[PDB]
Symmetry: C3
Subunit: 114 residues, 3 copies
């Protein structure tokens, strides 16, 4: 799986160990070994949520399967919680886009997961 | 709706008010309240369009519905116009990817929109 | 097509000519004129792959058709090869998400490709 966070929160406000914490938390949540989990945090972004430049985040989670109604609700609770506690971003200023990827459409190690 | 612009135009060339203008005009275009509109502008990018490093932009617009043939043509006219006027990027060096998101696949405020 | 690379590799390790090489090699592989190819490289990213901060890349390739099992494998070999040779990223620390875009959902030059 792949989790990306774009945020206007500055680089110095991203705790050391945030990437490792996201990796571990997502491995637990997706039921996948941490070796397949990729995380990407992009601070200092020029963005607005509802016309406002208060702290916000635009995120995505891509996974081959393990994507759906209840799972996405549980991921949103998890990830907003982490963004609230660690980056001090209110949950109502976070979007997370979920993508269920087909294995043939994910390249890795010179081939795909097909 | 979420609008993201990635561009090789420098940060100094993005005028004051640009994020607010994008939010307002997307609100006008989509009819949707400005409170749920998210905008993100990423200048100074290393990119090429047709092998040339003249000003260009790679964009995306995600919406839960309000995506389709006529609507996307209308959004393209609007957004290319704004990019041409404000960032001096030619419309023929802009790509905009449109995504019709399922409400179950958009996380917000510890849940999703389903 | 449009090809985007996000990587923790520093800007100085991206060789001169890299965008042009990507454009030419993608034009070659897809059998398309280089005028249709857009490329975007984002170095210096805060990212991990499997909890490790060794060199890695998170990429996407968007195309209007010409996406599928065999073609995606061929693209992965090509693009992993380039990232390995030029950026010294191991192929098993690269993800490439492939997207088959509908022509109606790609904006360009004030309209869409529909
Ligand atoms: O090579 C592509 O598929 C292609 C892809 C993009 C693109 C930009 N963001 N996401 C994308 F997928 C843009 C132009 C392209 O050239 C065209 C454009 C229209 C076409 C219509 C029919 C058949 C082939 C076509 C090829």
């Amino acid at each position: 799986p792949m989790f990306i966070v774009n945020t206007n929160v500055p680089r110095a406000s991203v705790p050391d160990g945030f990437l490792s914490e996201l990796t571990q938390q997502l491995a637990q949540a997706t039921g996948k070994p941490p070796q397949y989990i990729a995380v990407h945090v992009v601070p200092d972004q020029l963005m607005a949520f509802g016309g406002s430049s208060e702290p916000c985040a635009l995120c995505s989670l891509h996974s081959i399967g393990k994507i759906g109604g209840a799972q996405n609700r549980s991921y949103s609770k998890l990830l907003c919680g982490l963004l609230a506690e660690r980056l001090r971003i209110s949950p109502d200023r976070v979007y997370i886009n979920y993508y269920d990827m087909n294995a043939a459409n994910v390249g890795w190690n010179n081939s795909t997961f097909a």
